[PDB]
Amino acid sequence: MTNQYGILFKQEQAHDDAIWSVAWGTNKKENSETVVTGSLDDLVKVWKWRDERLDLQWSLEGHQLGVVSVDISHTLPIAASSSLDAHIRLWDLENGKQIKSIDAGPVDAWTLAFSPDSQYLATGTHVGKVNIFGVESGKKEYSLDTRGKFILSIAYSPDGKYLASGAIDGIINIFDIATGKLLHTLEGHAMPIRSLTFSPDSQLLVTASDDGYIKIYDVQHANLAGTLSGHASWVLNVAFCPDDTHFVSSSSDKSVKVWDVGTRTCVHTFFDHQDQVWGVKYNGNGSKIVSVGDDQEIHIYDCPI
Amino acid sequence: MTNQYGILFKQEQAHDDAIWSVAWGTNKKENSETVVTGSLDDLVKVWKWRDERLDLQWSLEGHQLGVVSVDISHTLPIAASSSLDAHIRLWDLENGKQIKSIDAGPVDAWTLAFSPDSQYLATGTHVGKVNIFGVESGKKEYSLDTRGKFILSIAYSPDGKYLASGAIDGIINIFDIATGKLLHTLEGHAMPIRSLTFSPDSQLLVTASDDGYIKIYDVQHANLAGTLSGHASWVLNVAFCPDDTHFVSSSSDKSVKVWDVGTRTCVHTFFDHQDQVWGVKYNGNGSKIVSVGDDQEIHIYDCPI
Amino acid sequence: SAGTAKWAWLRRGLYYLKAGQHSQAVADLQAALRADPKDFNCWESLGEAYLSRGGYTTALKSFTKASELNPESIYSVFKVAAIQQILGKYKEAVAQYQMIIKKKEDYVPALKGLGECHLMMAKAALVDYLDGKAVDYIEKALEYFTCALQHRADVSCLWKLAGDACTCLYAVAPSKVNVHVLGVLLGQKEGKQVLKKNELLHLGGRCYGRALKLMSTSNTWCDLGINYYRQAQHLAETGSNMNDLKELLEKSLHCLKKAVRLDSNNHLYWNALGVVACYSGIGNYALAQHCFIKSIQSEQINAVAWTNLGVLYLTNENIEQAHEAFKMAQSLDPSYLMCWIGQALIAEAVGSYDTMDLFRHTTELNMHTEGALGYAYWVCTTLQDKSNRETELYQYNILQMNAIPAAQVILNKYVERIQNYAPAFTMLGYLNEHLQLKKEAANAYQRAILLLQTAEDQDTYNVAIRNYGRLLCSTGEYDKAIQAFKSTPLEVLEDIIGFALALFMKGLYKESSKAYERALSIVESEQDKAHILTALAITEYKQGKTDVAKTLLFKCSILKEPTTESLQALCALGLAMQDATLSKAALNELLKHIKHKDSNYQRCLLTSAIYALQGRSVAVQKQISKAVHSNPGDPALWSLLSRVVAQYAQRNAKGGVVAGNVAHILDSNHGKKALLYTAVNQLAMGSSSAEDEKNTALKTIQKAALLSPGDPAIWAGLMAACHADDKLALVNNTQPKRIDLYLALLSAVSASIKDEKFFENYNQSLEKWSLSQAVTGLIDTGRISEAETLCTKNLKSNPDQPAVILLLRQVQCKPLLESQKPLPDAVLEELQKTVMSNSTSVPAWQWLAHVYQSQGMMRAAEMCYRKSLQLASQRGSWSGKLSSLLRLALLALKVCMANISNDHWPSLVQEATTEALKLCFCPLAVLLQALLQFKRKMGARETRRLLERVVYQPGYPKSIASTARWYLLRHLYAKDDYELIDVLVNNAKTHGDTRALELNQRLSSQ
Amino acid sequence: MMETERLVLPPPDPLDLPLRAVELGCTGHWELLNLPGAPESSLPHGLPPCAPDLQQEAEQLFLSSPAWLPLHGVEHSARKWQRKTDPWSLLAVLGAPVPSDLQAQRHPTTGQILGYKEVLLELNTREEAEEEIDFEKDLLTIPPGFKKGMDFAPK
Missing domain, CATH: 1.25.40.10 (Tetratricopeptide repeat domain)
Structure with a gap:
C-alpha cells in the first residue's frame, strides 16, 4: 500500500568535511530550486538543482570556523549563516558576495531562523533569551526572555504570531510575536531538544529530542497528540511537509525515516547514508527530500505525493 | 619408571608488571626454541631455551599502551606484536630492529595470527572485521566482513582454507580462505570466547569460553561433540600439541589443566601462579608447556608423550 | 452538424432532467456543452444533472468550470463550495463561505454552511481528546447560528442545528466550558452572556423544543429525548440532586416513546430507547432488552444494538452469552471499539493472559476512556511486581512495545477528560517519575493532594503527601518540601527518611542526624539498616567530626552482611582524608566477596x-x-x-x-x-x-563543541587550539588565521562556568587559566589596549592577586623592549620583585630571563634559567625541565656566536646538551652540539662527520635538517670538494629547499 | 646580576642565519624558525585543565549527599492501586439526521434563483401516524440467533 520511494541523485563529495545544515528554497516564482549547505569549513556552497541534477553555482566563504546553521529566504534572494566564529554575516546569493556582518559570540547566537516575511532573523543566545536582529535595518532591537538554560532551536509558525524555542535540559517555550509575552511553557523531554518545527497553518508543533522520541504537541494549548518512538539513537532534525500529512526525521543512527501525522506511523525508512545525518528538508510543493550527512554526501530522494 | 610432570623452571621477575601474551617458535631446527613475551609494557622480551633455562637475549620496545598479543612465525624467523593503540610491529628476531611498523586505524587490529606459509598475518577488529595485512609487502590486502560484535580471538587453520573467529557476544564464524564465502555461523555460547584453536590435521575445532566451559566442534558439520566443565573461573587460552592427543587450558582461577580429547577428562592440573594465568603454549613437540600469569612469572612445565 | 444547436440540446436536456431519465439528460447536456463549451448555464445544469444521480466529482469539476467565468454569481460559488464541503476538506469551504460573506452579508445558506463546518470540526476534535478546541469551535458555531437566526427565524433547520451544536458538549469535564452566547438565544436580546455546562444543555433543550413546535417530525423528537437524557446524566453525575430528576427522565422516555411509535421501522429510535431505558435512575431492563431486539430485527447490519446487548448481559453476570453477543457484533463490523473493550473486560473477568494485549489494541484503535484506564492500570501493576524481569511478559510487553510512553500519553488524555479521580493522577505521576519528567510528576502529585484533602486520609492522603514532598525535594524547592513533610504523621519509615533528606539538602545537619536516628530505631529489612547507617555517616561527616562517621561505618561493616554501598562510602571517606590506609583494606574487602555490581x-x-x-x-x-x-x-x-x-x-x-x-x-x-x-x-x-x-585538534574540538556546547572545558580547548594553529601556521609562513576571537570565548567560558553545581577548585583553575591565556593571546596578536583594559578591570574588581599583576607587567612591557631601548634599574627591580613574589611557576622565570637576554644580561639570564630548571625538577614536572635546559643551551650558544673570550660558555653548552640527550633524543640539542663544534675549531673531519650524520639520517624535522644542510654546505665549500657539493645538491633536490641551493648559486661564482 | 651590561655587534656575520626556537606541545617536539625574535613558544601556560582530578571527583560522587543510596530511589515504596471497572460507559447512542435541506427555487425558463425554500427530505397522542405500540403488554425476550434471553422481574 505504500508508494514508490527512491533516490534521484547522489553527490559524491560536496565538501571536504562534515555537513552540518541544509536549506531548500524555491524562493522565486519561477523554477529556482536553490540549495544552501554549510559544513565544517568556511564554505557555504550554493548548489542549484536545475533539471535532473545538482550543479554547483557559488562557493562563497568568509568564515573562520565551521558553520553550525544556515538558512535561506523564500521572498528575497538572500542567505544567512552563523558559526563558532562569532559572526552572523549574511550573503547575497545573487553575486556570491557578502552583504553585512553582525558581531555576536557563542553567548549571543547559536542557530538561525528567518522571519516568514524575511525581516527579523531571530537567533538563540546562551543565557536563555532569544535575540531578534534586524535585516536591512541594523542590529539587536529586542530580545524575548525565558529564565532557563542554553537555548538551541528556534522556529516560526508560517503565519507569524508564534515563536518556539527548545533548550538544553528539555523545557520548551512558546512566545507570541504580537505582544512578546510567554504564553505557556511545555516541559517536554529530559534531554536537549536541538530541533523543532511547526506545520503549515501553524496548529501542530513537532519536536525531536535527544533521547529518541518525537513528541507531537498541539499549539494554543499543552495537549500532546502522541509520542513517535522508532529510532535507535539521537534525533537531530525534523522537517515538516508542505501539506499537513507527513514529515521527515533524521537520526544519528544513519537512517532517514518519513512519518505521517494522521495515523502516527512510519511509512518509509531510508537506509542509504553511512554516517550521522545532520539535515533533511522538503522542496516547494513537497515531493523530494534533501539529506546532508556527517559523511560528505548530499542525497536527493523521491517521495511521491 | 614413570616420568611425572615437573615444574622444571621458574622465572621470578620476567617483566615489571603483568604478562599477557606468550609465543613459542621452533623456527630454528637446531636448539633455539625462541620464546617471546608481551607484558603490559612497551617492552617485549625474547628468551631462548638453551639447555635447561631461559637466558635473555634482548628486550625491545616502543609501544604506547600495554601489548595484548604477540606471535612468532614458524617458516621464517620473524615476530609480530600488536598493542592497545592498534599499532602493529614486526621484529626481525635476529637483531631486534623493527623491520616494519604496520599502522592501523582507531579500530583496525586487536590480536594477530600468522598464515601457515607466513604470508598474511590476519587480525581482528573492534567492529567485527577480520581484515588481513599482507606481511612485509602489502597493507590492508582485503577485509573479510561479518555482522556482529567485538571479535576478541582468532584461530586459523594449520592445513589451510579455514579461519575461525570468536566474538564478544559468544558466536563463532568460520570463513574459508579459498574464496572468502562465509561458510556457516555457529551460535556457540552467551559469553565471550577469548581463545580459538584448530587441530593438526585440521578437522577438530576447540573453543574456550568465559563461563568455564570448553567446546569441541567438528569442522565438517556443526556437531557439538563435546563439553568440558572443570575450570571454576573463566578460561583464557587453549592450545593443542603436534599430535591429536590432548590440549592445555588456562583458567583465570590460577589453574592450568591438561585435558584430553580421547577420554574428555583432566589428566593433570598444576598449582602455581598466585595471580591469574593469561597464556599457555606448546613447544615444537609434546615435551614442554609454557604458562605466563598475571603475576610476573614465566613457567615451563614438562609432559612426556 | 457540429454544435450550433445549443438551444435545442438545452430544451431536450431539461425535458429529460425534469423527468427521472438521468442518463438521457446527461447525454443531452454533454452534447450541449460540446455545442459551445463556454456557456456557464450548460456547465451548471450538467453539474446539477450529475448531482441528482450518483456522481459527485464530475459534477464538482463541471460546477467549478461554470463558476470560473462570471464569478459574480453567488449561487455558482455557493454550489462549488457545498460540493467540495460534502467530501470533507472543510477548511477550504470555510474560506470560500467567508469570502462570500465578505461580498454579501445577508446570505443565510453561507452562515448555515459556516456553522455546519465549525460543528463538524468540533465533533472531529471530540473524537480525539482536544477539548479546548472543541469548546472554542462550538462557541464560534453558536455565534454563526444566532447571526443566521437573526435574518430568517421561521426555518426549522437553523434551530435544529443550533440545538445540536450546543448540546454536543456533553462529557466535556465541566469547569472547562464557558460559552459566550449572545442575543436572541437567551430570550431578550441584551449584550452577551457566559454560560456554564448545565445552562448550555438547558438552552439546547429549549432550542430543540422551539424547532419541534413548528415542524413535528420523528428525528427532532428523538434528538430532544437524547438531550433530556444528557441533561439528567449531567445532573446526577455531579451529585447535585437525586429523586428530583424523576420527572425529567419521564419526559425523556415520553419523547423517545413518541418518536418510536411515530415510525417503528428505524433502528435508531429503538436503539436510543433501549439505551435510555436502562439508565440507573429508571432501571427497566426488560424494556431495554426488548428494544435492542427490535432494533436488531428492524435492520440486520447493526453493531450498536449487539454491543449494547452484550454490555447489558455482561453487567448482569452473563459472561458467556455477552461474549457471544460481542462476537456477533464484531463479526458485523470489525473496527467498532466498544465490542473490543467488552471483549477485554470479559477476558479480565475470567482471568485470561491476553487482557493486556487486548487493552493495548483498544488503546491503539481510537482512545476510549475505559480502555485507557484499564491499560494504564495494567502497565503500572506489571511495573510494580519485581519478580517479573525475566518472564518474557514484562520483557516483551514493556521493553518491546514501548508500553510506558504510550501509557503516559493515554493517561494524559484520560486525565484531561475526567480530572476528578485521584488514582489516575497518582498513576500519571508514577509513570512520569519513570520517564524522569520530574516536574510533571510533581504537578500530578500536587493535584492529587488537592483532590484528596477531604478523603478518609489514612492510606490515601499521607502517602500522596510523602510522594509529593519527596519528589519536590528531588528538584530544588527545599523549603516547600520541608513544609509538606511537616503536615504528615512522622511515624512511618518513609516519611521520616524523606524529612531527613530534605533537611539535609537545606542544611540543618543536626536536625537531619536526629531524624535519621529516629528512623534507625524503627528498622526491619536490614538493607534499610545499612543504608541508614551510611546516610548517618555522610550527614555527620558534612559537619566535620569524621572519626565518629568512620567508626559508625565500621559498625555497619560488623553487621552480618555488607551492602556494597557502605564500603564505597568508606573508601571515599578514606580518600577525603590523607590517611590512605583504611582505604586499601576497604577496597580489598569490597573486591573480595562482591561481584553482583x-x-x-x-x-x-x-x-x-x-x-x-x-x-x-x-x-x-x-x-x-x-x-x-x-x-x-x-x-x-x-x-x-x-x-x-x-x-x-x-x-x-x-x-x-x-x-x-x-x-x-x-x-x-x-x-x-x-x-x-x-x-x-x-x-x-x-x-x-x-x-x-x-x-x-581544531577539528575534533569543533566537533565536541557542536555535540555539547554547555561545558566550560570545550571553549578553553578551543582557545588553546586556535593559538597552537596560529603558531604552526606562523612557522609554515602561509597566513595567520582566526585572529581576534579570544574575548568572546572568555565570555563563553565564564558564562558556562556560572551554572555548574560545585567543583570549586576545578572552576577556579579553569577561570584563571582562561584569563591568562586570553591576555597572552591578545598581547601576541597585537591588541595591547584591550589586554591592558582587561587587566585593569580585573584588578579593579578585587584586591591584588600575584598572578594578574604579572600579566599587567607583561602587557605594559611589550612596546618597550620590542624596539631597542635602554631600561633603568628601577624597572628591572620592579619586574624582578613581581616575578619573585609569584614564584613556583616556571613560565614566569623563563619570561624574566628572556627579558634579561633581550636587554643583555647573559650571566643573569643563565642564573634565572638555572633556578627555573631546579624549580621544575623539584616539582617532578618533565616538559619544563627539557624546555629550560634547551633554552639555556641556546643562550650559551648565542653568546658564543660573537666569538667572545672567557671560554666558559662552550662548557655550559656541552653540559646542557649532554643532559638533554640524557633525557631524550632532542634533534635541536644535537644540532646545537654541531653548531658549537663548528664555531670552535671549525675543522675538517669530525665536524663534517657530525653534520653529515645530522643531515643524512631520516626521521628529522625539516627546518633543523635545512639549517644543518646549509652549514654543512658552507663547511664543504670551505674545504673544496665539488663531488660532495653536487651530492648535497641532489640531496636538496630530492627534498624541498630554496635556500641551500641559493647559497650554492651565490658561492659558485665568488 | 654581575655584568650589568653587554655590548655585542648586531650584524655579526651577514651570511649565517639567526636561530628561532619554537616549541610545540608538552611531549618534546621543537622546531626552528629563521627570522630573529622572541622565543615564541606554543601553549605558554600549559594544557587547558580538563575534567577534575580523581580524588575530589570520587568524594563528590559518594559524599555529596545520601540521595544516591538505593534507599531514596523510585522503588522502595511498593505502592498499590485499586481497579474499578465501569461497563456502563460502553453504551453508544447515535443521532438522527436533519430532514430538510433549504433547496433553491428556479424560474421555469431562463432559470434564476428566486429564493431558498425549506422542504422535507424523504401524552398529547397525535393522530398523524401513531399506531399505539404497547411497551408493557408482551415483551419480546429472545435475541435473534441465541437460544435464550433473560427474564427480569417486572416493575
Whole structure:
C-alpha cells in the first residue's frame, strides 16, 4: 500500500568535511530550486538543482570556523549563516558576495531562523533569551526572555504570531510575536531538544529530542497528540511537509525515516547514508527530500505525493 | 619408571608488571626454541631455551599502551606484536630492529595470527572485521566482513582454507580462505570466547569460553561433540600439541589443566601462579608447556608423550 | 452538424432532467456543452444533472468550470463550495463561505454552511481528546447560528442545528466550558452572556423544543429525548440532586416513546430507547432488552444494538452469552471499539493472559476512556511486581512495545477528560517519575493532594503527601518540601527518611542526624539498616567530626552482611582524608566477596584514585589499561583511559588519542567527553602526524563543541587550539588565521562556568587559566589596549592577586623592549620583585630571563634559567625541565656566536646538551652540539662527520635538517670538494629547499 | 646580576642565519624558525585543565549527599492501586439526521434563483401516524440467533 520511494541523485563529495545544515528554497516564482549547505569549513556552497541534477553555482566563504546553521529566504534572494566564529554575516546569493556582518559570540547566537516575511532573523543566545536582529535595518532591537538554560532551536509558525524555542535540559517555550509575552511553557523531554518545527497553518508543533522520541504537541494549548518512538539513537532534525500529512526525521543512527501525522506511523525508512545525518528538508510543493550527512554526501530522494 | 610432570623452571621477575601474551617458535631446527613475551609494557622480551633455562637475549620496545598479543612465525624467523593503540610491529628476531611498523586505524587490529606459509598475518577488529595485512609487502590486502560484535580471538587453520573467529557476544564464524564465502555461523555460547584453536590435521575445532566451559566442534558439520566443565573461573587460552592427543587450558582461577580429547577428562592440573594465568603454549613437540600469569612469572612445565 | 444547436440540446436536456431519465439528460447536456463549451448555464445544469444521480466529482469539476467565468454569481460559488464541503476538506469551504460573506452579508445558506463546518470540526476534535478546541469551535458555531437566526427565524433547520451544536458538549469535564452566547438565544436580546455546562444543555433543550413546535417530525423528537437524557446524566453525575430528576427522565422516555411509535421501522429510535431505558435512575431492563431486539430485527447490519446487548448481559453476570453477543457484533463490523473493550473486560473477568494485549489494541484503535484506564492500570501493576524481569511478559510487553510512553500519553488524555479521580493522577505521576519528567510528576502529585484533602486520609492522603514532598525535594524547592513533610504523621519509615533528606539538602545537619536516628530505631529489612547507617555517616561527616562517621561505618561493616554501598562510602571517606590506609583494606574487602555490581567504572575509578593518593602517578594509567583489557567493551573505560593519560603521564599522547577515538566509535552518547579528551591529547602531542587535514585538534574540538556546547572545558580547548594553529601556521609562513576571537570565548567560558553545581577548585583553575591565556593571546596578536583594559578591570574588581599583576607587567612591557631601548634599574627591580613574589611557576622565570637576554644580561639570564630548571625538577614536572635546559643551551650558544673570550660558555653548552640527550633524543640539542663544534675549531673531519650524520639520517624535522644542510654546505665549500657539493645538491633536490641551493648559486661564482 | 651590561655587534656575520626556537606541545617536539625574535613558544601556560582530578571527583560522587543510596530511589515504596471497572460507559447512542435541506427555487425558463425554500427530505397522542405500540403488554425476550434471553422481574 505504500508508494514508490527512491533516490534521484547522489553527490559524491560536496565538501571536504562534515555537513552540518541544509536549506531548500524555491524562493522565486519561477523554477529556482536553490540549495544552501554549510559544513565544517568556511564554505557555504550554493548548489542549484536545475533539471535532473545538482550543479554547483557559488562557493562563497568568509568564515573562520565551521558553520553550525544556515538558512535561506523564500521572498528575497538572500542567505544567512552563523558559526563558532562569532559572526552572523549574511550573503547575497545573487553575486556570491557578502552583504553585512553582525558581531555576536557563542553567548549571543547559536542557530538561525528567518522571519516568514524575511525581516527579523531571530537567533538563540546562551543565557536563555532569544535575540531578534534586524535585516536591512541594523542590529539587536529586542530580545524575548525565558529564565532557563542554553537555548538551541528556534522556529516560526508560517503565519507569524508564534515563536518556539527548545533548550538544553528539555523545557520548551512558546512566545507570541504580537505582544512578546510567554504564553505557556511545555516541559517536554529530559534531554536537549536541538530541533523543532511547526506545520503549515501553524496548529501542530513537532519536536525531536535527544533521547529518541518525537513528541507531537498541539499549539494554543499543552495537549500532546502522541509520542513517535522508532529510532535507535539521537534525533537531530525534523522537517515538516508542505501539506499537513507527513514529515521527515533524521537520526544519528544513519537512517532517514518519513512519518505521517494522521495515523502516527512510519511509512518509509531510508537506509542509504553511512554516517550521522545532520539535515533533511522538503522542496516547494513537497515531493523530494534533501539529506546532508556527517559523511560528505548530499542525497536527493523521491517521495511521491 | 614413570616420568611425572615437573615444574622444571621458574622465572621470578620476567617483566615489571603483568604478562599477557606468550609465543613459542621452533623456527630454528637446531636448539633455539625462541620464546617471546608481551607484558603490559612497551617492552617485549625474547628468551631462548638453551639447555635447561631461559637466558635473555634482548628486550625491545616502543609501544604506547600495554601489548595484548604477540606471535612468532614458524617458516621464517620473524615476530609480530600488536598493542592497545592498534599499532602493529614486526621484529626481525635476529637483531631486534623493527623491520616494519604496520599502522592501523582507531579500530583496525586487536590480536594477530600468522598464515601457515607466513604470508598474511590476519587480525581482528573492534567492529567485527577480520581484515588481513599482507606481511612485509602489502597493507590492508582485503577485509573479510561479518555482522556482529567485538571479535576478541582468532584461530586459523594449520592445513589451510579455514579461519575461525570468536566474538564478544559468544558466536563463532568460520570463513574459508579459498574464496572468502562465509561458510556457516555457529551460535556457540552467551559469553565471550577469548581463545580459538584448530587441530593438526585440521578437522577438530576447540573453543574456550568465559563461563568455564570448553567446546569441541567438528569442522565438517556443526556437531557439538563435546563439553568440558572443570575450570571454576573463566578460561583464557587453549592450545593443542603436534599430535591429536590432548590440549592445555588456562583458567583465570590460577589453574592450568591438561585435558584430553580421547577420554574428555583432566589428566593433570598444576598449582602455581598466585595471580591469574593469561597464556599457555606448546613447544615444537609434546615435551614442554609454557604458562605466563598475571603475576610476573614465566613457567615451563614438562609432559612426556 | 457540429454544435450550433445549443438551444435545442438545452430544451431536450431539461425535458429529460425534469423527468427521472438521468442518463438521457446527461447525454443531452454533454452534447450541449460540446455545442459551445463556454456557456456557464450548460456547465451548471450538467453539474446539477450529475448531482441528482450518483456522481459527485464530475459534477464538482463541471460546477467549478461554470463558476470560473462570471464569478459574480453567488449561487455558482455557493454550489462549488457545498460540493467540495460534502467530501470533507472543510477548511477550504470555510474560506470560500467567508469570502462570500465578505461580498454579501445577508446570505443565510453561507452562515448555515459556516456553522455546519465549525460543528463538524468540533465533533472531529471530540473524537480525539482536544477539548479546548472543541469548546472554542462550538462557541464560534453558536455565534454563526444566532447571526443566521437573526435574518430568517421561521426555518426549522437553523434551530435544529443550533440545538445540536450546543448540546454536543456533553462529557466535556465541566469547569472547562464557558460559552459566550449572545442575543436572541437567551430570550431578550441584551449584550452577551457566559454560560456554564448545565445552562448550555438547558438552552439546547429549549432550542430543540422551539424547532419541534413548528415542524413535528420523528428525528427532532428523538434528538430532544437524547438531550433530556444528557441533561439528567449531567445532573446526577455531579451529585447535585437525586429523586428530583424523576420527572425529567419521564419526559425523556415520553419523547423517545413518541418518536418510536411515530415510525417503528428505524433502528435508531429503538436503539436510543433501549439505551435510555436502562439508565440507573429508571432501571427497566426488560424494556431495554426488548428494544435492542427490535432494533436488531428492524435492520440486520447493526453493531450498536449487539454491543449494547452484550454490555447489558455482561453487567448482569452473563459472561458467556455477552461474549457471544460481542462476537456477533464484531463479526458485523470489525473496527467498532466498544465490542473490543467488552471483549477485554470479559477476558479480565475470567482471568485470561491476553487482557493486556487486548487493552493495548483498544488503546491503539481510537482512545476510549475505559480502555485507557484499564491499560494504564495494567502497565503500572506489571511495573510494580519485581519478580517479573525475566518472564518474557514484562520483557516483551514493556521493553518491546514501548508500553510506558504510550501509557503516559493515554493517561494524559484520560486525565484531561475526567480530572476528578485521584488514582489516575497518582498513576500519571508514577509513570512520569519513570520517564524522569520530574516536574510533571510533581504537578500530578500536587493535584492529587488537592483532590484528596477531604478523603478518609489514612492510606490515601499521607502517602500522596510523602510522594509529593519527596519528589519536590528531588528538584530544588527545599523549603516547600520541608513544609509538606511537616503536615504528615512522622511515624512511618518513609516519611521520616524523606524529612531527613530534605533537611539535609537545606542544611540543618543536626536536625537531619536526629531524624535519621529516629528512623534507625524503627528498622526491619536490614538493607534499610545499612543504608541508614551510611546516610548517618555522610550527614555527620558534612559537619566535620569524621572519626565518629568512620567508626559508625565500621559498625555497619560488623553487621552480618555488607551492602556494597557502605564500603564505597568508606573508601571515599578514606580518600577525603590523607590517611590512605583504611582505604586499601576497604577496597580489598569490597573486591573480595562482591561481584553482583555491574558498573565496572566506579571500581576502576576508586582503585585509580587510591594509587594517585600515594603520589605514584604512573601506575594509575597502567591500572586503567589493565581494566580496559579485562573488558574490551564498555566505552566508558576507554574514555577514562583517555582522560587519565591526558592528566597523568602525558607522554603517551598517541595512545590517548587512539583510546579516545575508540571510545567515541563504540557508541554516540559518550561522544562529548571522549572528543574533549582526544582533542586535549592532540594539543599535547604537537604535530606528530602526516600533516593530514580533517584530523587536527581544531577539528575534533569543533566537533565536541557542536555535540555539547554547555561545558566550560570545550571553549578553553578551543582557545588553546586556535593559538597552537596560529603558531604552526606562523612557522609554515602561509597566513595567520582566526585572529581576534579570544574575548568572546572568555565570555563563553565564564558564562558556562556560572551554572555548574560545585567543583570549586576545578572552576577556579579553569577561570584563571582562561584569563591568562586570553591576555597572552591578545598581547601576541597585537591588541595591547584591550589586554591592558582587561587587566585593569580585573584588578579593579578585587584586591591584588600575584598572578594578574604579572600579566599587567607583561602587557605594559611589550612596546618597550620590542624596539631597542635602554631600561633603568628601577624597572628591572620592579619586574624582578613581581616575578619573585609569584614564584613556583616556571613560565614566569623563563619570561624574566628572556627579558634579561633581550636587554643583555647573559650571566643573569643563565642564573634565572638555572633556578627555573631546579624549580621544575623539584616539582617532578618533565616538559619544563627539557624546555629550560634547551633554552639555556641556546643562550650559551648565542653568546658564543660573537666569538667572545672567557671560554666558559662552550662548557655550559656541552653540559646542557649532554643532559638533554640524557633525557631524550632532542634533534635541536644535537644540532646545537654541531653548531658549537663548528664555531670552535671549525675543522675538517669530525665536524663534517657530525653534520653529515645530522643531515643524512631520516626521521628529522625539516627546518633543523635545512639549517644543518646549509652549514654543512658552507663547511664543504670551505674545504673544496665539488663531488660532495653536487651530492648535497641532489640531496636538496630530492627534498624541498630554496635556500641551500641559493647559497650554492651565490658561492659558485665568488 | 654581575655584568650589568653587554655590548655585542648586531650584524655579526651577514651570511649565517639567526636561530628561532619554537616549541610545540608538552611531549618534546621543537622546531626552528629563521627570522630573529622572541622565543615564541606554543601553549605558554600549559594544557587547558580538563575534567577534575580523581580524588575530589570520587568524594563528590559518594559524599555529596545520601540521595544516591538505593534507599531514596523510585522503588522502595511498593505502592498499590485499586481497579474499578465501569461497563456502563460502553453504551453508544447515535443521532438522527436533519430532514430538510433549504433547496433553491428556479424560474421555469431562463432559470434564476428566486429564493431558498425549506422542504422535507424523504401524552398529547397525535393522530398523524401513531399506531399505539404497547411497551408493557408482551415483551419480546429472545435475541435473534441465541437460544435464550433473560427474564427480569417486572416493575
